[PDB]
A = this chain, B = another copy of it.
Amino acid sequence: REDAELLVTVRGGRLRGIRLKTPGGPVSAFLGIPFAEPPMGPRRFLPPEPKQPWSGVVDATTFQSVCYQYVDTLYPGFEGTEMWNPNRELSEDCLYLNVWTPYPRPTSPTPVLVWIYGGGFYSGASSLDVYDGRFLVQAERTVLVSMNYRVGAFGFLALPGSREAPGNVGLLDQRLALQWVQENVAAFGGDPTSVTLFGESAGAASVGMHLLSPPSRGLFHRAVLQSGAPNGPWATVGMGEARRRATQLAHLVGCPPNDTELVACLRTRPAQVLVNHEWHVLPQESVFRFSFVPVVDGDFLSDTPEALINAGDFHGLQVLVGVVKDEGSYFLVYGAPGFSKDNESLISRAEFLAGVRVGVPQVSDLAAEAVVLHYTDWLHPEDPARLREALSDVVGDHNVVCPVAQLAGRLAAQGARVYAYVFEHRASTLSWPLWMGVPHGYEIEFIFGIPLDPSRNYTAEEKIFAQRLMRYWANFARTGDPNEAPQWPPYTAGAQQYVSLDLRPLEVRRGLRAQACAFWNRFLPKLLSA
């Protein structure tokens, strides 16, 4: 009758899962497991509370609701943007996690991968097709866990010092899920002593912040940061600016009639009302800037991530970090003047100079001049194709590449063993224009083995590539070393060695854009202080 492999008892009660099909065999999935009380009504903006025990059997056969978030409408119906939009109904009752295990369930402790999705801390969901864990679990025989966490104002609105809206509760949602993994993953066959965190963009920034927060450190053992870092200029906000943004949001939604009255009024508004106004609390026009992000208030982060990275002892830590070939191109169509996915975006010098202030917001004119000096080819100062690639480099280096390069350099120089990559394969199914190259976020589908889905149109070569990348990632989760063949050397602050990931065998190189990142990481901070 009923498959005993799909019945699991966790600390809170009983669950019923579903058997999933994959080209290489079945997989056990437990989707929509509640790990927190629904953060609704008076519980909104508050830290999550552990889910109370239940009687009966929870149906864990389908994904649960997506946390309330903005839905992108720039190119309606376009696959390049719809693949990131919510594929389930929106709700504040969204604190659920998902578990994939081999079928039948492992009888021996199995290494655990925990996925934290990205989306600028304002969007994302564990239920997106591109995060389907069935292929990783079947091919590499790990336990895969992913959780939903609150985004936008619901997860990161902060009136610092107030208890009604302390901030960082979305990060606490992630920590609660990691604590749930420690207490319950063995019931699925997972090994709670071998937990690897991996995430992309804001998910990678989240992974980095769990590395720098002592209460989260005991919950995992290895970390993978893809196209993101906690020291990115978009990843955190100071207490003063957080209070300003929280206050303006209240004003824009008709609040208030102290912090208590302000939060109480915010709690009376429908969730969609807060979503409709959250982008308007940003101080200026920009790309790669987000309204409600983690706040540095001395609690979750006792100091800025950059400060915590410099003062940290990282011996015994192994981290896998990397970027895609063209980190900046995706963001240019959301505000940079002259850009669009439907033409070549061959911009003029005037549009380039205007894009610099959009891509590098909230800096002095002198700082902007330094950017223009560094990213101008003064033998071809007005060539539109060069200007298009240059502004993509500005946005990509400033927000992703150089923050990741700095994290990798400091971690390596202070005990950690770092492996660095650059993902350089443009998917044959990529629907973005060719000038965007390999855009932000389009390595994920290969890490998750999506090309193995036979109902998709990836090539035979791309399937072998996905299997290669799944092996690297799983090798790292098992041993802290992706290697098995051309060897992948560790990244060091001196040699700065990394590998390129594409259809060709591994190629070792030096320097994660060393010349450009010396500007962003070494000189520009000095310029802004004086």
Contact = CB atoms under 8 A, between A and B. Distances in A.
Nearest to A522: B373
A370 interface: yes
A350 interface: no
Nearest to A364: B530
B511 A379 contact: yes
Contact of A378 (B376, B377, B511): B511
Given A366-B526, A366-B527, A366-B530, A519 B379 contact: no
A373 to B, nearest CB: 4
Interface in A346-405: 364, 366, 369-370, 373, 376-379
Contacts of A345: none
Contact of A496 (B377, B379, B514): B379
A55 interface: no
B373 A523 contact: yes
A514 B366 contact: no
- In the complex, the count of this chain's copies comes to 2
A65 B514 CA distance: 56
A280 interface: no
A510 interface: yes
A334 B21 CA distance: 78
A376 B523 contact: no
B514 A370 contact: no
A518 interface: yes
Interface residues of A, number: 22
Nearest to A529: B366
A378 B515 contact: yes
Given A373-B522, A523-B373, A510 B379 contact: yes
A382 to B, nearest CB: 9
Contacts of A511: 378-379
Contacts of A369: 522-523, 526
Interface string A140-154: 000000000000000
A233 B511 CA distance: 35
A378 B526 contact: no
A379 B519 CA distance: 14
Contacts of A370: 523
A520 to B, nearest CB: 11
Interface string A76-104: 00000000000000000000000000000
A379 to B, nearest CB: 5
A530 B528 CA distance: 11
Contact of A373 (B366, B379, B496, B518): B518
A37 to B, nearest CB: 50
B373 A514 contact: no
A19 B527 CA distance: 65
Nearest to A521: B378
A515 to B, nearest CB: 6
Given A366-B530, A379-B496, A527-B527, 14 more contacts: A366-B526, A366-B527, A369-B523, A369-B526, A370-B523, A373-B518, A373-B522, A373-B523, A377-B515, A378-B514, A378-B515, A378-B518, A379-B511, A379-B514
22 contacts: A366-B526, A366-B527, A369-B522, A369-B523, A369-B526, A370-B523, A373-B518, A373-B519, A373-B522, A373-B523, A376-B518, A377-B515, A378-B511, A378-B514, A378-B515, A378-B517, A378-B518, A379-B496, A379-B510, A379-B511, A379-B514, A379-B515
By Cβ-Cβ distance, the 4 closest A-B pairs, closest first, are A378-B514, A373-B523, A378-B518, A379-B511
